[PDB]
DNA sequence: CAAAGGCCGAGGAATGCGCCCTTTTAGCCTTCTTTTGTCAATGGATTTGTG
């Protein structure tokens, strides 16, 4: 929901794409950073988790 | 006039999961100035030598 608020703040309909097609990016990024930041007890940085 | 079936939705495992790029932040790594511990001199005030 936080990520979706962020995407809603950035949506421009001048292009004509669906809102889903844009906001899905910010939503999935928000959720992924959330899991990578606050899911392990010992916090691994995000790039190391990608590795 | 009902039945089969095509459709949609409400609910779950999981073989499920970002990338490329800019920008700050930590920390290690060298270089230098200063406080500190050390070696040698160099007299100088008790300790002993003397009769």
Name residue, tokens 């928000």: A30
Is the shortest CB-to-strand distance from A32 to strand B under 7 Å?
yes
Place of tokens 């421009």: A12
Q: Which bases of chain B are contacted by protein, using any atom under 7 A from a CB? A: 17-19
C1’ B20 / CA A47, Å: 12
Instruction: Quote the tokens at residue A31.
Output: 């959720």
Q: Which residues, 6+ apart, have CB-to-CB distance to A29 below 8 Å? A: A3
Q: Nearest 5°: CA angle at A28, between A38 and A4? A: 95
Cβ atoms A16, A28 nearer than 8 A: no
Q: Rounded CA gap, A41 and A51, in Å?
A: 18
Q: What's the resolution in A?
A: 3.0
Under the phi-then-psi rule, with left for phi > 0, alpha for psi from -120 to 50, and beta for the rest, what region is A9?
alpha
CA of residue A5 to C1' of nucleotide B48, angstroms: 101
Tokens of A40: 């392990």
Q: Hey, what are A18's tokens?
A: 């669906």
Q: DSSP states of A19-43 as a string?
A: HHHHHHHHHHHHHHHHHHHHSSSS-
Helix (H, G, I), strand (E, B) or coil at A45: coil
Token code pair at residue A7 = 């995407």
Distance A1 CA to B51 C1' (A): 113
Name the experiment that determined this structure.
cryo-EM
**Residues 6 or more apart in contact with residue A7 via CB below 8 angstroms:** A22, A23, A25, A26, A27
């Amino acid at each position: 929901n936080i990520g979706l608020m962020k995407a809603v703040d950035k949506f421009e309909y001048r292009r004509g794409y669906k809102f889903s097609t844009y906001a899905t990016w910010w939503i999935r990024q928000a959720i992924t950073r959330s899991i990578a930041d606050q899911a392990r007890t010992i916090r691994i940085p995000v790039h190391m988790i990608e590795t």
